[PDB]
Write a protein that binds this ligand. Structure first.
Ligand SMILES: *[C@@H]1O[C@H](CO)[C@@H](O[C@@H]2O[C@H](CO)[C@@H](O[C@@H]3O[C@H](CO[C@H]4O[C@H](CO[C@H]5O[C@H](CO)[C@@H](O)[C@H](O)[C@@H]5O)[C@@H](O)[C@H](O[C@H]5O[C@H](CO)[C@@H](O)[C@H](O)[C@@H]5O)[C@@H]4O)[C@@H](O)[C@H](O[C@H]4O[C@H](CO)[C@@H](O)[C@H](O)[C@@H]4O[C@H]4O[C@H](CO)[C@@H](O)[C@H](O)[C@@H]4O)[C@@H]3O)[C@H](O)[C@H]2NC(C)=O)[C@H](O)[C@H]1NC(C)=O
Ligand SMILES: *[C@@H]1O[C@H](CO)[C@@H](O[C@@H]2O[C@H](CO)[C@@H](O[C@@H]3O[C@H](CO[C@H]4O[C@H](CO[C@H]5O[C@H](CO)[C@@H](O)[C@H](O)[C@@H]5O)[C@@H](O)[C@H](O[C@H]5O[C@H](CO)[C@@H](O)[C@H](O)[C@@H]5O)[C@@H]4O)[C@@H](O)[C@H](O[C@H]4O[C@H](CO)[C@@H](O)[C@H](O)[C@@H]4O[C@H]4O[C@H](CO)[C@@H](O)[C@H](O)[C@@H]4O)[C@@H]3O)[C@H](O)[C@H]2NC(C)=O)[C@H](O)[C@H]1NC(C)=O
Ligand SMILES: *[C@@H]1O[C@H](CO)[C@@H](O[C@@H]2O[C@H](CO)[C@@H](O[C@@H]3O[C@H](CO)[C@@H](O)[C@H](O[C@H]4O[C@H](CO)[C@@H](O)[C@H](O)[C@@H]4O[C@H]4O[C@H](CO)[C@@H](O)[C@H](O)[C@@H]4O)[C@@H]3O)[C@H](O)[C@H]2NC(C)=O)[C@H](O)[C@H]1NC(C)=O
Ligand SMILES: *[C@@H]1O[C@H](CO)[C@@H](O[C@@H]2O[C@H](CO)[C@@H](O[C@@H]3O[C@H](CO)[C@@H](O)[C@H](O[C@H]4O[C@H](CO)[C@@H](O)[C@H](O)[C@@H]4O[C@H]4O[C@H](CO)[C@@H](O)[C@H](O)[C@@H]4O)[C@@H]3O)[C@H](O)[C@H]2NC(C)=O)[C@H](O)[C@H]1NC(C)=O
Ligand SMILES: *[C@@H]1O[C@H](CO)[C@@H](O[C@@H]2O[C@H](CO)[C@@H](O[C@@H]3O[C@H](CO[C@H]4O[C@H](CO)[C@@H](O)[C@H](O)[C@@H]4O)[C@@H](O)[C@H](O[C@H]4O[C@H](CO)[C@@H](O)[C@H](O)[C@@H]4O)[C@@H]3O)[C@H](O)[C@H]2NC(C)=O)[C@H](O)[C@H]1NC(C)=O
Ligand SMILES: *[C@@H]1O[C@H](CO)[C@@H](O[C@@H]2O[C@H](CO)[C@@H](O[C@@H]3O[C@H](CO[C@H]4O[C@H](CO)[C@@H](O)[C@H](O)[C@@H]4O)[C@@H](O)[C@H](O[C@H]4O[C@H](CO)[C@@H](O)[C@H](O)[C@@H]4O)[C@@H]3O)[C@H](O)[C@H]2NC(C)=O)[C@H](O)[C@H]1NC(C)=O
Ligand SMILES: *[C@@H]1O[C@H](CO)[C@@H](O[C@@H]2O[C@H](CO)[C@@H](O[C@@H]3O[C@H](CO)[C@@H](O)[C@H](O)[C@@H]3O)[C@H](O)[C@H]2NC(C)=O)[C@H](O)[C@H]1NC(C)=O
Ligand SMILES: *[C@@H]1O[C@H](CO)[C@@H](O[C@@H]2O[C@H](CO)[C@@H](O[C@@H]3O[C@H](CO)[C@@H](O)[C@H](O)[C@@H]3O)[C@H](O)[C@H]2NC(C)=O)[C@H](O)[C@H]1NC(C)=O
Ligand SMILES: *[C@@H]1O[C@H](CO)[C@@H](O[C@@H]2O[C@H](CO)[C@@H](O)[C@H](O)[C@H]2NC(C)=O)[C@H](O)[C@H]1NC(C)=O
Ligand SMILES: *[C@@H]1O[C@H](CO)[C@@H](O[C@@H]2O[C@H](CO)[C@@H](O)[C@H](O)[C@H]2NC(C)=O)[C@H](O)[C@H]1NC(C)=O
Ligand SMILES: *[C@@H]1O[C@H](CO)[C@@H](O[C@@H]2O[C@H](CO)[C@@H](O)[C@H](O)[C@H]2NC(C)=O)[C@H](O)[C@H]1NC(C)=O
Ligand SMILES: *[C@@H]1O[C@H](CO)[C@@H](O)[C@H](O)[C@H]1NC(C)=O
Ligand SMILES: *[C@@H]1O[C@H](CO)[C@@H](O)[C@H](O)[C@H]1NC(C)=O
Ligand SMILES: *[C@@H]1O[C@H](CO)[C@@H](O)[C@H](O)[C@H]1NC(C)=O
Lengths: 447, 130, 130, 447, 130
């Protein structure tokens, strides 16, 4: 009896992948400071982002299969190179370094004398600088060299731009949509009872860190435990905190900028003498706040590893510095902190057997993150003492393979892949494409 | 905005206009662009208009020539989801609906462009002469 | 080309086609482009087609589905520019006209897409069944 | 009774801003010489530009708020960098310069000997060049250096391309329109009785000059006087001439190109010895023609400053060379002329109390215009004597602040902002966006 | 696909739909692009959509407002290819046809946009009022 009829705009979608753009909230642009991080031409965010809750809908999510992570990961990487392209390349810094021990703590800093090319190509320049032990390597008084020269080339980051993370909303173009999981407890896998849609994702700060998720999103009620394959010890375990952890990372060295001239037109910023406290970089964590969280977190692992079992914590096993330490950026400088003091504990079924704690941190200006070869970035010196306060919102953890599985299990800080850091904020999001065209049988026919 | 996706097809016909609007047009709109990350905010919106005109051809070449809803002279085959009328709109949902028609979807498409607007417009030419 | 903008609305209806033509399509058209100043001759014409399809959606979702002039079933409210018919076309100009309607402009828009093509096409579906 | 009806293409527009492209007249492309100025991919101009006069229309214009100026200003700037990017960079020219006085007029030219790198990286090259006093600065025989080396880097303009200004029509994309003011007397502010529309603006030659508008558009009938804020002495005063003023600027030095080889593959063009008249660059203005204009111009100022008053002229007060002199380009070289001789006069109410005049001009190859730091352009030497004839179509003027306002007023040549130069041709143009959609009540309803 | 180009105009009307399809939409479609040879795969497809909307304006501003075939009130002038009906469709081919009309092509175009949809829609407005 009936007849076919074309309906346009029916609620039908399929899971797919597209190219997502950013959103800066149109305030980051007023923050200026010559293109901070991403925001330059960055899409300002709709003042009123729209979130529509879909009733009577259940959708299955997988955060580990999420494509927004891979795009974001490649975005930061592509973003990094574009920042270093217009800046000043440090290529003729491979000159011999004659170094000596700084005036305590086994001479971590080296005072190095070397020859340099001036604006003119005729006469050289005899000048000295100050490099960390991590930035230099001796070759056989004490003679050193740049640590990256044998591996690759090097370029200096511009002092105008800042590495300051700013909120970035990922949005989808026309024909696409972004799904948001509104449940309080979600491990990133399984069906999602309450699903809402948004044009733009929430504020996401691209904070690059290791062993500690900084400035991230808090969980709801109970703390969350996420892992790709849990019984598998080869897979990292992502944790989401309820309450934020106060962390202080400072640069207890009050410095000055040389701004030496290697012209014509170019000026390099050398690290001058340190005026102030003679100290190594340090990281503070309040003993009461970390413990309280630990007691709550260690109980969540027993929802899997069993009601009663012994959970012991320990510092990093070994590997690259990026893996073994907490790597991040504060005030433009890159800190590498020793977390061994926090991870020293042993817990009972519900319990573990002072007013403050500190963590030794190391500073490295010349870095290759993401296993990049051919390009090394030099972090420019900062005037004065740098102080920063951030939230610790989560961790990257790995389980040991030694078993004795039915006895006890030990967990250690993870590292490596930075996608996990983005999976922390993107677990509730996935990309689907909308299929508007539809057909239905009805009597109307046509004349 | 997609709110009736969980609801029945009968209820999903009321908010049909909303999906048409938001889906159709999406301009932020920002002129600024750069050599890298400017090509990223381009490649996305260029694919948007390519996917769009792809849909619009079907609306024109079929018996619609207009948006939202339009009808046709193609009779509904029994072999295509033999059902009850109240079992479709009142008791069933679109996602659940498109699930079954997946086999006959390409067949119906042929009936719209060939059996109608190819043979209908020609029929019209023969009926408009007298 | 805009020649009747100073003239009355009644006279402005004759040259209506001219504005439609020139406005609609604008291709120089030059293929050559370069990394800088090639992106400048792009950004302008890309915004042209984005602004264009934005207008076309309204023409389709409303009771037009066709260009130039088309009519609708929306009754003209007295509260909306209560006037004389000869006071509009014969004595008044478009720029002068759009000036007053500015408050009711968004209201009328709702009557076209919702009150008509949402409720009209559905009405048509109910009237085309019998 | 009536019913609403959609009208498409109604004559309704709103003032807005968009991105405008160029037009080259499709002849400039046949002029070739490897991308002269702008025209490379430049839009050829419609052989028949369309100008439609709108009857019964009055639109208010402001030339100082015009956005076409800001775009054009940024265009020339962006155009300038793209020309210097593929060319040869002069970076290792900062070598010490041993200079001596040329064989009259207090030794303006310096003969400089210096060391240079050859194609090979082994042996240097002992060679001499000839630089103007303005291009070099001594540092403490006579030893000099490049004047830009302490400030910035430097790059040489390619000899293939030319700086020759070519007519450029600014046009608007679909959905936009350009308004043209057809009145004979327009100061750039107030209502415009007769307005016409064009797809493309008229022929506009991007001639960059200071204190003198060269190769511009003539006024109609009376000469025109334009100022942003007139009573305000801080605002420059733009003048539009009726009759064009004959001006001659030549390079009375017959030169040769060295084309030295700093390979591999690169060749620099040095300035060789001068063969011919021993002279300084000079600018000629006919005493009769300048005066006649002056008498007509000085009367227009009295339409504001009052029927009777004393108007005295004087040369530039002081500042940067770009401000204090007339800066332009002829034959590829950049002249800086001394206008002090022309601006020496004193006028009565209608009058002021030989066959020729001349103006000392200075030449500078290394220039930073538009206050640009980090990039300095070197103007390549030209074979033979350069001669050029241009029209003087207008001025940039400033009024003194010292008052004594009710006594007398003195005017001096302005400078600085180059937007004023573009405001001279763009005063009759502004950008608006067209809004085609419209609604009107009619009886037709629908079936 | 163009198969009837050699065949007669009468036979060329059956496969008309095929030409409409393939011509209309052409997406490979590949997102990847680079600074050079990415601009080459752009410049081609950008000219495709510019040439397309150029054609679509004529379809709308004329008495069609729909694709494939549509008719009009413009009477065929004798001075325009005075012929036999069987001498056109049955005995003649399109390429051979467009060859002769080349002189009157621009004239006919005027009759569609001006003589019809300018004067027809206005006529419709006057006939829809009563
Ligand atoms: C995510 O991570 C998790 C963990 O972190 C991963 O889980 C791992 O999954 C793999 C599967 O790929 C498992 O390996 C498979 O194990 C099964 C089962 O083996 C157990 O049971 C056997 C039988 O048990 C019954 O019978 C006895 C006797 O009556 C009873 O007492 C019992 O109570 C039970 O009732 C038993 O034989 C097994 O013991 C043997 O193996 C273990 C493990 O190596 C040894 O320690 C023992 O000493 C002993 O040797 C075990 O207890 C096996 O059946 C699978 O074998 C298949 O695959 C082999 C390749 O790995 C292949 O060589 C075999 O031939 C066999 O293939 C056969 O079966 C196929 C399917 O039918 C046929 O197609 C095929 O042709 C052939 O016939 C396999 O070894 C891991 O155990 C599991 N991890 C852990 C810790 O348990 C998961 O994979 C990850 N996933 C992702 C997506 O990341
Ligand atoms: C373009 O350029 C032009 C010029 O090139 C610019 O024009 C300039 O515009 C500014 C306005 O921003 C003017 O300043 C303002 O002047 C007025 C008027 O001042 C004059 O008259 C006063 C009264 O005159 C009458 O009364 C006497 C007594 O009976 C009679 O004899 C007279 O004949 C008159 O009838 C008089 O008091 C003034 O003299 C004082 O000021 C001058 C100038 O500084 C001194 O030389 C004198 O010695 C004497 O001190 C003068 O003669 C003032 O009223 C304005 O003051 C307001 O703004 C001040 C900030 O500048 C603020 O501190 C004051 O409190 C006051 O604000 C009051 O009024 C506001 C408005 O009602 C209130 O909101 C506010 O709360 C407060 O109550 C101001 O000083 C410049 O004079 C003028 N330039 C010239 C050369 O005249 C123009 O701005 C430019 N525009 C653009 C877009 O570029
Ligand atoms: C990382 O760094 C951050 C920032 O430094 C640390 O967070 C801060 O922690 C401190 C101490 O834990 C805390 O300081 C107190 O804040 C109170 C308000 O919240 C203040 O009222 C209080 O001031 C009193 O004490 C000071 C020291 O004793 C006095 O110098 C001061 O004058 C105050 O004394 C007054 O008040 C008393 C009555 O209470 C009155 O009798 C007196 O007359 C006088 O009026 C402290 O300064 C900061 O508030 C914290 N900051 C934030 C942002 O939370 C964090 O602990 C660090 N983490 C680690 C691991 O080190
Ligand atoms: C900037 O430079 C420009 C270009 O040089 C200047 O503009 C030129 O100005 C000159 C003089 O002011 C002018 O030259 C005259 O042009 C006339 C045509 O317009 C010529 O007829 C004339 O030639 C006669 O005089 C010459 C010198 O006396 C003789 O050499 C020549 O043979 C001519 O004589 C003949 O004619 C007489 C009768 O008149 C006859 O009896 C003789 O037998 C013989 O046949 C001049 O050359 C140029 O025309 C101007 N050029 C332009 C383009 O306008 C400008 O003045 C300069 N400005 C400044 C400030 O210096
Ligand atoms: C995790 O999140 C925390 C909190 O958001 C981040 O901490 C931020 O750290 C940045 C520095 O990297 C801070 O930026 C600083 O802002 C200070 C305050 O600026 C206001 O006040 C001044 C007046 O003093 C106003 O003029 C100004 O407009 C602002 O309203 C500045 O004083 C700072 O400048 C000084 O410090 C930097 C280095 O820190 C030096 O380079 C400067 O030269 C100068 O000495 C600086 O601009 C920011 O304010 C901090 N957030 C908050 C809320 O305070 C962590 O950095 C982040 N973690 C990571 C890894 O990014
Ligand atoms: C204001 O406007 C005036 C007038 O438009 C400009 O003056 C122009 O100056 C340029 C030079 O910058 C002139 O270009 C010159 O053209 C001459 C004539 O070319 C014709 O004749 C030759 C035969 O001799 C034909 O083969 C050719 O196809 C043309 O038909 C050339 O002879 C010139 O070459 C010589 O001079 C230049 C430097 O001037 C040298 O570099 C060359 O190597 C060679 O020695 C040159 O090509 C142009 O002709 C002038 N205009 C007019 C109308 O003559 C002003 O420059 C302008 N002001 C500013 C600031 O730009
Ligand atoms: C590690 O976490 C434990 C909680 O599991 C912390 O124990 C806390 O210890 C303080 C004392 O230092 C307790 O405060 C006490 O409160 C009672 C009741 O008001 C009062 O009688 C005592 O005089 C004292 O003030 C606190 O209650 C207790 N926490 C809980 C949950 O009971 C411990 O402080 C943490 N580690 C560190 C660094 O102390
Ligand atoms: C400055 O401008 C004034 C005009 O305001 C110029 O005065 C001009 O002087 C010449 C003489 O050198 C005048 O020509 C004369 O013409 C009369 C009448 O034909 C004749 O009798 C004389 O023998 C002589 O030929 C000219 O008329 C006069 N201008 C005007 C408008 O009257 C003056 O020349 C200019 N400055 C210079 C450089 O001379
Ligand atoms: C790092 O070593 C340099 C020398 O290579 C020190 O600079 C010298 O400082 C002394 C002060 O005791 C001066 O007398 C010398 O003239 C300095 N020489 C040069 C070349 O600068 C420098 O002081 C050392 N580090 C610091 C600043 O503590
Ligand atoms: C990070 O912290 C741990 C724990 O304090 C440090 O381990 C010490 O290592 C030294 C040798 O380098 C031993 O002499 C100490 O006995 C160790 N301490 C303890 C408590 O066992 C470690 O050195 C720190 N830093 C690094 C880079 O390893
Ligand atoms: C520009 O022209 C003026 C006017 O001729 C020059 O002023 C002369 O300056 C010198 C000193 O440099 C004095 O000795 C002369 O007496 C001045 N001339 C007059 C007429 O007063 C000026 O030097 C010229 N050039 C520059 C660069 O200033
Ligand atoms: C300087 O300190 C280092 C420790 O890193 C030590 O190995 C070296 O022997 C010291 N040099 C001198 C001269 O004491
Ligand atoms: C319905 O479909 C069957 C098989 O698909 C076919 O045999 C039959 O002819 C179709 N009937 C109509 C009316 O299309
Ligand atoms: C060369 O001329 C300059 C004038 O610029 C003068 O200062 C200098 O003393 C002269 N040198 C000699 C050696 O005469």
């Amino acid at each position: 009896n009936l007849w076919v009829t074309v309906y346009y705009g029916v609620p039908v979608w399929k899971d797919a992948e597209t190219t997502l753009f950013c959103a800066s909230d149109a305030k980051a642009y007023e923050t200026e400071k010559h293109n901070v991080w991403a925001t330059h031409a960055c899409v300002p965010t709709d003042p009123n982002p729209q979130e529509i809750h879909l009733e009577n809908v259940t959708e299955e999510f997988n955060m580990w299969k999420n494509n927004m992570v891979e795009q974001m990961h490649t975005d930061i990487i592509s973003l990094w190179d574009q920042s270093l392209k217009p800046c000043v390349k440090l290529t003729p810094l491979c000159v011999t370094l004659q170094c000596t021990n700084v005036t305590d703590m086994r001479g971590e800093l080296k005072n190095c004398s070397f020859n340099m090319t001036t604006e003119l190509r005729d006469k050289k320049q005899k000048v000295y600088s100050l490099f960390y032990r991590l930035d230099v390597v001796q070759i056989n008084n004490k003679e050193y060299r740049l640590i990256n020269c044998n591996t690759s080339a090097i370029t200096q980051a511009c002092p105008k731009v800042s590495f300051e993370p700013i909120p970035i909303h990922y949005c989808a173009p026309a024909g696409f949509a972004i799904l948001k999981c509104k449940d309080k407890k979600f491990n990133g896998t399984g069906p999602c009872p309450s699903v809402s849609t948004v044009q733009c994702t929430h504020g996401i700060k691209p904070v690059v860190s290791t062993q500690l998720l900084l400035n991230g999103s808090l969980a709801e009620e109970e703390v969350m435990i996420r892992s790709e394959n849990i019984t598998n010890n080869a897979k990292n375990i992502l944790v989401q905190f309820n309450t934020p952890v106060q962390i202080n990372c400072t640069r207890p060295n009050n410095n000055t900028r040389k701004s030496i001239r290697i012209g014509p037109g170019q000026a390099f910023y050398a690290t001058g003498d340190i005026i102030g406290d003679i100290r190594q970089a340090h990281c503070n964590v309040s003993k009461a706040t970390w413990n309280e969280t630990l007691g709550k977190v260690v109980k969540q692992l027993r929802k899997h590893f069993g009601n009663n079992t012994i959970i012991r914590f320990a510092n990093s096993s070994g590997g690259d510095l990026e893996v073994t330490t907490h790597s991040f950026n504060c005030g433009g400088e890159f800190f590498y902190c020793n977390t061994s003091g926090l991870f020293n504990s042993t817990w009972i079924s519900n319990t573990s057997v002072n007013d403050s704690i500190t963590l030794p941190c190391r500073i490295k200006q010349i870095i290759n993150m993401w296993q990049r070869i051919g390009q090394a970035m030099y972090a420019p010196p900062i005037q004065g003492v740098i102080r920063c306060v951030s939230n610790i919102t989560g961790l990257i953890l790995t389980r040991d393979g030694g078993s004795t599985n039915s006895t006890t299990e030990t967990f250690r800080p993870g590292g490596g892949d930075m996608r996990d850091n983005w999976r922390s904020e993107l677990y509730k999001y996935k990309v689907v494409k909308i299929e508007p065209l539809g057909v239905a049988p009805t009597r109307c026919k046509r004349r | 905005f997609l709110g009736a996706a969980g609801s029945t097809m009968g209820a999903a016909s009321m908010t049909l206009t909303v999906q048409a609007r938001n889906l159709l047009s999406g301009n932020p709109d920002w002129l600024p662009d750069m050599t890298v990350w400017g090509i990223k905010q381009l490649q996305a919106r260029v694919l948007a208009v390519e996917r769009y005109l792809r849909d619009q051809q079907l609306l024109g070449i079929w018996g619609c020539s207009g948006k939202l809803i339009c009808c046709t002279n193609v009779p509904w085959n029994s072999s295509w989801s033999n059902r009850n009328l109240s079992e479709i709109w009142d008791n069933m949902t679109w996602l659940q609906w498109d699930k079954e028609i997946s086999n006959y979807t390409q067949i119906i498409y042929g009936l719209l462009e060939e059996s109608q607007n190819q043979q209908e417009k020609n029929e019209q030419d023969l009926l408009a002469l007298d």
